[PDB]
Amino acid sequence: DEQPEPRTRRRAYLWCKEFLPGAWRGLREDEFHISVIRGGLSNMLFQCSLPDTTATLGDEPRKVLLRLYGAEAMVLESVMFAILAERSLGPKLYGIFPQGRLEQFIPSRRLDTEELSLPDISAEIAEKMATFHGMKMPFNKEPKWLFGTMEKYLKEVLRIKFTEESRIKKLHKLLSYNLPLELENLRSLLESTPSPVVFCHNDCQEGNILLLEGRENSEKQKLMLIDFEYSSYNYRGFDIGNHFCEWMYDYSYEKYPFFRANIRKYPTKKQQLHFISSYLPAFQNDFENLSTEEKSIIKEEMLLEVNRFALASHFLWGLWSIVQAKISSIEFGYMDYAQARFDAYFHQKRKLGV
Amino acid sequence: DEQPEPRTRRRAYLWCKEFLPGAWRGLREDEFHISVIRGGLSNMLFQCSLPDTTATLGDEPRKVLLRLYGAEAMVLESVMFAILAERSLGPKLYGIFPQGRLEQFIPSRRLDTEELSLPDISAEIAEKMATFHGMKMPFNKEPKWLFGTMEKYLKEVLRIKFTEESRIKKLHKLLSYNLPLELENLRSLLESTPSPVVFCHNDCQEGNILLLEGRENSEKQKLMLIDFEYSSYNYRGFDIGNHFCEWMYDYSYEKYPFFRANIRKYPTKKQQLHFISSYLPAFQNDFENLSTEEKSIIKEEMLLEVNRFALASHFLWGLWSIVQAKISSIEFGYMDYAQARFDAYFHQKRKLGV
Ligand SMILES: CN(C)c1cc[n+](Cc2ccc(CCc3ccccc3)cc2)cc1
Ligand SMILES: CN(C)c1cc[n+](Cc2ccc(CCc3ccccc3)cc2)cc1
């Protein structure tokens, strides 16, 4: 039950006392409870609560989450969060300030990688993503995010000068593929792959899906998608393809390189069909009322769409991870992860016949 | 029908084409229509529209408002605007970017000063303000805004060194009252005046109230309150008192000092009672079900509350206007307006016996 630094405790007390109504407003510092949920250098998370012996005066929360950012993007992220809260699609927003946010506390745990393949879990994720994709949001709707970001990362990657031997070697191998040309071949494939532009999460992995406390044995409505900070208008195929890729990566491994990758855990076509069978009628209202024939065509075209876009998940996050090897202050086997994504990229490309 | 600068036209075209869906996305520059609604140095407003010969593809707007800011506050204002849009309490928000916003276009005109006293108009304003005051918003709830802002302004005002003769003279007269002491006497009065802390508009004047096109002959729901940028948690008495003060000031006068002030146009007690009779049951659900006796007590206490807080509208905006005389690039008789507010302050104080 980790306690924050006295400085952080006092700042948290003041934020809660000033931004939250009812019993919070008259709270004494020596009555304030706070514990560290997640440490680190950025997005530190704390649980803040009233004393058990303090009654609420109205409908103020008894417990809240404090997010500290640490050490235009701010405007967009804050507006998006506020909008998703209003629409009941994310945690409520209780307070916003230069240093962080006070959010609704949602009793829950995160999903584990293996849970992504449970049929009921996968069905709900599909429904939740289809819902998220229907959001109208006040952001640029031109789908420049995917290749814009890949181009940016590629430029950064080409110019990295490592000083450490193993990183120099792994980088040389990764750049030996001719990434500018390969990126262009990917662009060509994806340009011939129709995929609607929708508000995408862009990071639908197990670590960003809450299993809601007390709902674990309920068939539906037991999940919440969170951590929208990378969301943007983007190709629908990317969001689904990226999710499918996440079946293969477990980030909870406690030893170096602090992840495991398993190509054999990518969803089978049967599993993908189960997922898209839940996605489609959640995204397109009267989908169920189409002929078995037209449903099957729509499903077949979507399978090809999402599996082609899955290549962009590998390519983008592969480049991303090389960049983190250069710039990150967090411990993780970034170069080995990069190699794993590019290995998966070529394996997938082969299976596609592309 | 004023046209913007070619540079502004092109930027507006690009914002509309990228942030708005359907027919907007394929629009050609030579088809784009834009006209200036309001010029100036900051918050320039433009109307943007599709050609009459272009059909919409879905439910995209045919016409929008572009606001350009010109030359933490940004985060808070943008979040507030997004939240009020979600709740149907302001215009929809279609796009947000560093330079401005794309908003819903609301066919309307602003109210004139004399229209504030029409019984049906005043009743609706009361209902709209009571609604606004029920908003829960993710902002600091400590009511430091009123005297915080007055202290800030007073400090600035004391140190102004004008070079122009008439401004030097008018300032000396305004500071002759001993404003630090008078501010403290006001604080003392208001500390003894209970007033709930609510989300306040802080600027409920005729220029910020839309009369909705086609609703002009409807008894109810013909107005919208807009221009929330000065909104904050604050004493309810201030928002209502400030509105009452606005009955006296007409900002449409075309000759120097570009406003008229008339002490005799302040609402009578009968008129104030009509306003609060609409406010209370809009703010407190089952108010109508209280005894005539308890309703009358609540009305009497509110009359005293709002009329005491009206003194703070005079004092705050009086100081504000002195500051604008020093710093503003807009033409207006700021020193004469300041004198008018302080004249009203003392007149009101006398009538209160305070
Ligand atoms: C920026 N963005 C939306 C993404 C970046 C990377 N990825 C893939 C990914 C996800 C998680 C990780 C693990 C991060 C981590 C680092 C240190 C300890 C534990 C986890 C690595 C790569 C998906 C989306
Ligand atoms: C910052 N704030 C919420 C306020 C500031 C001033 N006032 C009173 C007020 C309102 C309008 C004006 C007129 C502004 C104006 C300036 C030049 C041309 C036309 C109007 C002056 C004073 C109310 C609220």
Oligomer: homodimer
Number of domains of chain A: 2
| Largest sheet properties of chain A | 5 strands, antiparallel
Portion in beta strands of chain A: 15-25%
- How far do the termini of chain A sit from each other? 52 Å
CATH fold type of the largest domain in chain A = Aminoglycoside 3'-phosphotransferase, Chain: A, domain 2
Please tell me how large the radius of gyration of chain A is. 22 Å
How many strands in all of chain A?
Answer: 12
CATH architectural name of the largest domain in chain A: Alpha-Beta Complex
Q: Give the number of helices of chain A.
A: 10
Which chains share the greatest interface? A-B, 28 and 28 residues
**Would you identify the CATH H-level superfamily of the largest domain in chain A?**
Aminoglycoside phosphotransferase (APH), C-terminal lobe
Coarse shape of chain A: globular
Order of helices and strands of chain A: HEEEHEEEHHHHEEEEHEEHHH
For the record, the CATH class of the largest domain in chain A is Alpha Beta
Q: Considering DSSP H and I runs of 4 or more, what fraction of the residues of chain A is helical?
A: 40-55%
Heteromolecules bound: ligand QLW
Structural class of chain A: alpha+beta
- Order of strands across the widest beta sheet of chain A? 1-2-3-5-4
Quick overview:
The structure is a homodimer of 354-residue chains. The first copy, chain A, is α+β, with helices and mostly antiparallel strands and 354 residues long. Helix content of chain A is 46%, strand content 15%.
